[PDB]
Design a protein around this ligand. Sequence first.
Ligand code: NA
Length: 121
Amino acid sequence: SMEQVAMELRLTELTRLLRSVLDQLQDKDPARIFAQPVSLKEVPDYLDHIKHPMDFATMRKRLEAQGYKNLHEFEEDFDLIIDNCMKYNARDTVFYRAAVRLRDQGGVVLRQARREVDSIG
Ligand code: NA
């Protein structure tokens, strides 16, 4: 039905939009600390602390499957990247502090993206 196509076409240009939002977000992680999942070989205990594990590659894989139905589902996985690292690392570490930064630089990017999702529709 034409309604399916109108939804498919809406999903598409949400995912085009989010690709730009993901590329921008990731460019605030130039050290690339969040760009690949934390390894359960290198960190065998991660899962007795961290319940929903996440990184930018995983966000990328899901995205190209057009797996984010709204901006809020995208925001939800980003906050996991951030929130998992803060939880598992002490405040004085490079890791935790990168997580605080990525959140702050990131909020600018997610500000405009809300304005571009509602202006486009
Ligand atoms: Na902690």
